[PDB]
Structure formats: C-alpha cells, structure tokens
Design a protein around this nucleic acid. Structure first.
Ligand SMILES: Nc1ncnc2c1ncn2[C@@H]1O[C@H](COP(=O)(O)OP(=O)(O)O)[C@@H](O)[C@H]1O
Ligand SMILES: [Mg+2]
Lengths: 198, 96, 193, 325
DNA sequence: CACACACT
DNA sequence: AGTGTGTTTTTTTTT
C-alpha cells in the first residue's frame, strides 16, 4: 500500500556510463533553477491550496480502476490514484483535480508496473502452483504407499523418494505442513517424522 | 480417616498378570511394561479400596483395579494386536 | 459416608458421580475418580518410599471437556492447583527462586508444583508445552519431591500431588491402528512413569 | 420516548436482521456476511453457569478471516473507533503488555489487558496469523472458560475474561489460498480454533464482475463524495438497541430444542468423511455456538425464547462457514 | 574520635 | 554559652 512505487536500478549503458561519468567529471572539476525557492514555495502551496476532484476526473478514476482490474488491482492502489491526482492538483496551485492528473498517475504507476501488474508478487498469469504442488505430493504419497508397506513410513525415506523422481530437492517441512493442513480438515491424518493416510 | 491396607492380597494373580504383561511389549503397538507399572497397579488397588471407603482393602475391589489397569493397557495397544491381547486377557477380564 | 459405604454399588455411583456434566466417558470417570481417591502412600525402612499419589495421563481430542473435567476435579479434592502446561515452565512449576531487591537476597518463589503438593495437581495443554520443562516435571514427580540447588538455595521440597496430564493426539485424533507411541508426540519415559 | 418508538418500529419491522447490518460498518464489502457476523458478535451471548462447576461461556468465538487489502481491516477500524471500549491490535507486532495478562512492578501491579478494556467487548484483534503464539497462549486460557491467569509468579489475578472474540486472521501471503482452505491457511493452532466457534471463511479472487460494481463503489465510498451513507440506525440509537437487545435473551423452547437437535444431526451429516458424523468442526463447543447464535438471531427483536427460525439461520451461518474448502 | 552551625 | 552532628557502567550469572 504505497502510493507510487519506484524502481532504482544501477544498470548503466556504455554510452550512459560515458554520460554519467562525464557528469561526475563536471562534479570532479568543481572540487534557471532556484532550488532554494522550492522549499518556501512548496510550504506556501501547502498552506494555500486544497485540491478538489472533478466528476470528470471522478469518472477518470472509475474507468482507470476498472481497467487496472482488467489489465489484479488494489483498493490501496485506488486510494493511491486519488492521492496522486490530488497531488497533481497541488502542483501549479490549480487547486482542482484534473483529468490529466489521473492520467499521469496512471502512466507513472503503470510504468513502475512494467518494471500483469505483479503487485505484491501477484501475477494473474501463473498465479498459484499450490494445486500442482499438492497433487504432486499426494501422488508421491500413493507411490510410496504402493512401494512401501503401511500407510505411515519414515520421513527420511520420503525425502529420499521425493527428490529422485517425483519432484526436485524439497524440504519435508512443507510436506508436514501440508499433512497438518489436510488433518485440520480430517480428510487425512497427520503424524508429527511419518506420514499416515486416513 | 480411611486407610485401606493390603493385609490380604492375591500374590500369584498379580504374578500371572505381570507375566502376560511380558512378551507383549514386543509388539510395535505396545509400550514397555516395567516394575513401576506393577507398582501403579498396586496403588490403583489402594485407590479403589479408598474409594470403597473400607479401612481394609478388598480382594475383589483390587480385582477391579487390575481390570481397569489391564483395560487401560489394552487400549494403549495397536488395534491389530489389541484384539489378540484382549482375547488373551479375557481369562483375566471376566474375574474383573 | 459410612452408611453409603456399606451400601453396594457405591463404586458405580461414584463413577457416575465424577464429572456428571460430561455424558459418557465411564472409564475416564472411573480413572479420574480413583485418582481423586488416590493410592495409599508406602514407605520402606524410613527412606525407601512409594508414592500415594496417582499420575493420570490423558490423551483427548480438542473440545473433549478435558479442561472442564479438570475444573470439576478441582473444588472436589479441596487442596488443588491448575497447571496451564504451556504457561508454566521448569522453574515456574517445580521450584522457583526469585531475587528480592527489597531484602537484597535471592528468595524462594512459589513453585506451582509445591502448591500442588498436599493436594491434587491439574495439568493441561501438557502435550504442547516445553520438553525441558517436561523433563523437570519427570524429575520432580519421580521422588514426589523437588530438589533445587541454585543461587545459593539448596532447598528440597516435598511434592505430594496426584497429577493428571491433559494431552491431544497427533493432529487431535488418535489412530487406533497407529501405535500409541506414534500417536504420542512426547517421550517414552513420561508415559512409563 | 422517541427512543422507545425507534425500538418498537425496528423490532416490529420484518427485516430487522440485515437492516442493522446495512447500518453496521461502512458496508463497503458487499458480502455483508462479515457485517452480520459483527452484528451477532455485538449481540453475542450471555455467559452460562451450569449447576455443576462447568460454567459455559456465552460469548461466541468468531473469525472474519479476510484479506488485509479487503474491507475487513476498515471494518475493524470502524468497530474500534465506534464500538464502546474495544481493543485494537495491529497484528504485525504483539506485546504481552497489550495482551490480557501482563506483569508490571510497582509494589506489584498488572498491566491493562485487552479484555479488561474490552469489558465483555469483542477481541478486535487483526492478523492472528501475525500475532505471536507466545501472545496467543495468553488468550488460549483466557478464551477457555473465560479465565485469565498467569502460571508465573506474582499476584496472577484472575482477570474476568468474559468477552467476545474475533480473530480476523489474515492467511499466509495475506491473500487466501483456495488450496489451503479455511483450515490450515495460517499458523493459528487447532486447539485455539477449536475454541473458535465459526469463521465465516475467507475467499479471495480476481472477480472480474466485482471490478464493475464494487470497483466503482470504492471511489464514491472514498473520495470528495465519500457520501455513501447507510445508517438505517443512528450511532447513539445503535448503542441504545444494542443495550435493549442485551436486556432480553432468547431461551430454547421444547419444539425449538427438538428442531435444533435435529439440525445438529444435519450438521453431523454435513461433517461426513468421519466417525459418528463427527461433531469435529461443529463440535460440542460449536453446539454451544448454535445455541448462542440462535439467541443472538433476533436478539435485537429481544424475543425471550429461541425459535426454529433462529436455529435455521444459525445453520445457514454454519454452512457458509463450512462448505468452503 | 571532633569541627561549623542553631540555638544553649 | 550548651551540645549536638555530619564527611570513607562492568561481569559473570543467571538462563
Ligand atoms: N461428554 C461431554 N459432555 C459434556 N460436555 C462435553 C463432553 N465432551 C466434551 N465436552 C465439552 O467440550 C468443551 C471443550 O473442553 P476442553 O477440555 O476445553 O477442550 P479441548 O479438548 O480443546 O481441551 C467443554 O466445554 C465441555 O463441556
Ligand atoms: Mg481443555
């Protein structure tokens, strides 16, 4: 629930390395934009302006949110849209939220998105693999039961079979947690160590 | 005021009881049986006799104590052996 | 009490008497009631001794009145204590010493098992609580007394208390086909004692 | 007098249930099941003292498990900022001082507990997957039999833990895992949830349809408009008929008793794939749950007797808290 | 033990 | 003038 996430990457091109290093050279050598006026100006802008959203900007928010749901999207991201639009209304002291305020909010957020949205590590494509992981674990359990007598058998041997054929090298803690989860529904029984079937 | 005493007792009944206790812990569903288990049976007999409130322990009340302890043991077993063990102890169960 | 004692069927009535608000559990009622009565303490040659108190081990599914069974047990045996199990520890339950700034020396802190001594000891949530604390409880119960030698306090306290541990099966459900030791997440020595 | 008239009109009206629900909370989440759970927990149930020592807790133990992104967080903010003497716990951090039982020197004192500040109010904690088990165990004993005590040295005063409880837990990864179901999506243990009567489940999905109506809803709910007001009942009046509902409490009638026992049998059938048609999820603890839920249903009506309609509605709440896997 | 204060 | 009264963090040790 950040308003506007940014990404700072130190991946510099050779020509970009030349340019940045030349900027350093200029910095090395010394060893209109008022800059200072910005602080007092922004203080007075805060003390003066109170942004107001327009119904046109309101519908901008509407279809931006529904699209970001389609192109999934966060309510906090929507409140962030509001904050960004109000902050743009704050710039230039226009005192009123505009359509282009919301549009630049959208463009900045989406530019950060491309880095669907992948917010909070949530991609609609390949969203969850827990179905396949649970089914693979269960199939390995039936394989062990066919191979090894009794429904319950030692966890070390399970760690042995899971890696060779069924799946990659994975810790038995995940399997034990899954078994405890299944027991909490009583569809299966949990032990501890050992994995007993219902 | 009540302090039941084991003045009368069934030595060999308890003897055969602990004998059956043996060669059962060999079962994977069976926990080991030790001397402190026998002392447990004795103190269960004392508790039963106190429950009977007589100042002297009763042999048959002690028998019910044996029955309760052996039933607890049988419940502790794996159900597969539990049936065989309950048939084996049935020679003890009827006396209660 | 004498008149009912000579009345027959008293034992069955007592079994029905213990925790009536828990329908069923005839064997459980029998066990807890006889624990309340407790065995006769025995001592040999003055030094060798046999406990007169009963340590009930209970495995119960969640929501099976175990805590409420304990609550009915207490107020019935007069002298009583409650062990939350997870809440207490090795020091807290068995024997505790507290540094006392007002007096400026280490002082004994009331071990809840000492509070258990002379009365019934309730134990709950024990299958989930700390294992080192469990070993401390083993030590304390073995001699019916707690011996502590630390912080200059070398005292030993008698702990005569009928204890009743409350436990949940692995996953909350005991598997009868499963061996008890596999159904139990705790040590073998404790079930032995 | 106008207060009495408002009570009369609201108890006499047909949809007294869910009218208050629309009145309760910002209702920004359109499901309103969470809000009616909030309603019932407002009404809750009175602690029950049996003839034996087993004094039955009256406060139903409910979860409203949902996402932190979803409206449950805002609903809990509404409750704490509105519901009298309610305790708010963020969830990410747990300090034993804020919990029910704590130790403060000077002589000797006890730090203020959540339930003492609750004063039978709901445990409005959030993110139970995020509170530490070291702090969970404080409420384990507390929500067992309404008993706050400390096994450690001190005064260990028996603080009166008679309070409603709301875990409001957020599962692993915050979002709900359909794979992990209602049970096991979270660290919160089986015994502590075994005390928890109902959960009202958690469901999270992209929900393309909701992106049309409720996505549009958020802005109007929150913005210069922020005027989606739905208080069929005033706040002051809200507390007033909360008090009035607590004045009268339904009791099972013989027909209602038979109806509820048969419906518990139906629950037992519903808990198939087990022995005895196991109580299991809907345990004897949850049998108490149905009893107190039937009490809380039409508690605002202040009916002095439990009716089969209340039992059926509680059954519906059970189902909405069951079938989800 | 023995020397500055506060009256003695 | 009676006679009274005041000054010499650390570190293990739990755990
Ligand atoms: N046979 C029974 N009769 C009556 N109440 C019972 C019975 N079995 C369980 N209960 C109820 O189960 C509830 C849970 O008890 P408790 O010991 O706290 O559960 P847990 O098994 O989680 O430790 C109690 O309120 C008790 O009344
Ligand atoms: Mg209990």
């Amino acid at each position: 629930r950040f308003d506007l996430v940014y990404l700072v990457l130190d991946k510099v091109d050779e020509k970009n390395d030349r340019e940045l290093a030349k900027h350093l050279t200029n910095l090395y050598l010394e060893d209109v934009l008022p800059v200072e006026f910005l602080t007092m100006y922004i203080s007075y802008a805060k003390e003066h302006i109170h942004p107001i959203i327009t119904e046109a900007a309101k519908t901008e928010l509407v279809r931006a949110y529904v699209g970001m749901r389609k192109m999934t999207a966060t309510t906090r991201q929507l409140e962030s849209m509001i904050r960004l639009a109000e902050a743009h209304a704050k710039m230039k002291l226009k005192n009123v939220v505009e359509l282009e305020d919301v549009q630049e909010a959208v463009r900045l957020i989406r530019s950060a998105i491309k880095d669907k949205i992948d917010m909070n590590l949530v991609q609609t494509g390949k969203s969850v693999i827990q179905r396949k992981l649970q089914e693979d674990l269960s199939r390995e359990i039936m394989n062990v039961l066919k191979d090894q007598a009794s429904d319950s058998m030692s966890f070390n041997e399970l760690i042995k079979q899971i890696n060779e054929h069924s799946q990659d090298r994975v810790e038995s803690s995940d399997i034990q947690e899954a078994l405890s989860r299944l027991q909490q529904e009583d569809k299966v029984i949990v032990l501890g160590g050992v994995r007993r079937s219902v | 005021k009540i302090y039941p005493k084991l003045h009368q007792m069934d030595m060999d009944k308890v003897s055969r009881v602990y004998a059956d206790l043996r060669r059962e812990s060999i079962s994977t569903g069976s926990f080991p049986i030790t001397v402190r288990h026998l002392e447990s049976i004795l103190r269960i007999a004392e508790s039963f006799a106190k429950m009977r409130l007589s100042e002297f322990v009763s042999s048959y009340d002690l028998d019910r104590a044996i029955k309760v302890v052996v039933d607890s043991f049988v419940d502790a077993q794996k159900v597969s052996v539990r049936r065989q063990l309950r048939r084996s102890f049935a020679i003890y169960t009827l006396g209660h | 009490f004498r008149k009912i004692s000579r009345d027959r069927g008293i034992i069955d009535k007592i079994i029905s008497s213990m925790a009536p608000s828990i329908y069923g559990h005839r064997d459980i009622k029998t066990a807890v009631a006889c624990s309340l009565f407790g065995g006769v303490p025995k001592n040999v040659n003055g030094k060798h001794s046999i406990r007169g108190d009963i340590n009930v081990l209970l495995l119960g599914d969640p929501g099976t009145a175990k805590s409420q069974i304990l609550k009915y047990v207490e107020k019935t045996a007069h002298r009583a204590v409650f062990a939350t199990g997870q809440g207490a520890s090795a020091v807290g339950l068995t024997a505790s010493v507290r540094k006392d700034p007002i007096t400026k020396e280490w002082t004994l802190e009331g071990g809840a098992l000492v509070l258990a001594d002379k009365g019934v000891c309730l134990i709950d949530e024990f299958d989930k609580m700390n294992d080192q604390d469990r070993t401390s409880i083993h030590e304390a119960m073995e001699q019916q007394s707690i011996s502590i030698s630390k912080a200059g306090i070398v005292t030993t306290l008698q702990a005569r208390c009928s204890i009743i541990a409350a436990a949940n099966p692995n996953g909350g459900r005991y598997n009868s086909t499963l061996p008890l030791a596999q159904n139990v997440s705790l040590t073998e020595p404790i079930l032995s004692r | 007098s106008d207060e009495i008239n408002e009570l009369k009109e609201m108890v006499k009206d047909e949809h007294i249930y869910d009218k208050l629900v629309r009145s309760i909370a910002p209702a920004v989440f359109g499901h309103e099941a969470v809000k009616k759970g909030i309603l019932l927990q407002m009404l809750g149930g009175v602690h029950k003292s049996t003839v034996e020592g087993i004094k039955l807790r009256g406060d139903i133990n409910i979860c409203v498990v949902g996402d932190p992104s979803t409206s449950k967080s805002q609903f809990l903010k509404y409750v704490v900022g509105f519901a009298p003497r309610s305790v708010y716990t963020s969830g990410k951090a747990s300090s034993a001082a804020g919990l029910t039982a704590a130790v403060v020197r000077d002589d000797y004192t006890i730090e203020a507990g959540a339930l003492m500040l609750a004063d039978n109010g709901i445990c409005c904690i959030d993110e139970f997957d995020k509170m530490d088990i070291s702090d969970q165990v404080a409420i384990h004993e507390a929500m067992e039999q309404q008993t706050i005590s400390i096994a450690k040295a001190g005064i260990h005063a028996t603080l009166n833990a008679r309070t409603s409880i709301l875990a409001a837990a957020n599962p692993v990864g915050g979002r709900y895992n359909r794979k992990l179901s209602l049970r096991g999506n979270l660290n919160m243990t089986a015994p502590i949830m075994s005390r928890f009567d109902l959960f009202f489940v958690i469901l999270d999905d992209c929900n393309e349809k909701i992106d049309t109506e409720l996505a549009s809803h958020i802005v109007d709910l929150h913005m210069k408009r922020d005027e989606a007001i739905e208080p069929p009942f005033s706040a002051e009046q809200l507390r007033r008929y909360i008090k009035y509902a607590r004045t009268f409490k339904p009791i099972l009638t013989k027909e209602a008793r038979s109806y509820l026992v048969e419906k518990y049998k139906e629950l037992r059938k519903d808990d198939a794939q087990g022995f005895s048609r196991s109580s299991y999820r809907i345990t004897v603890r949850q049998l108490e749950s149905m009893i107190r839920l039937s009490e809380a249903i039409a508690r605002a009506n202040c009916v002095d007797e439990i009716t089969p309609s209340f039992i059926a509605e509680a059954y519906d709440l059970l189902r909405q808290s069951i079938i989800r896997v």
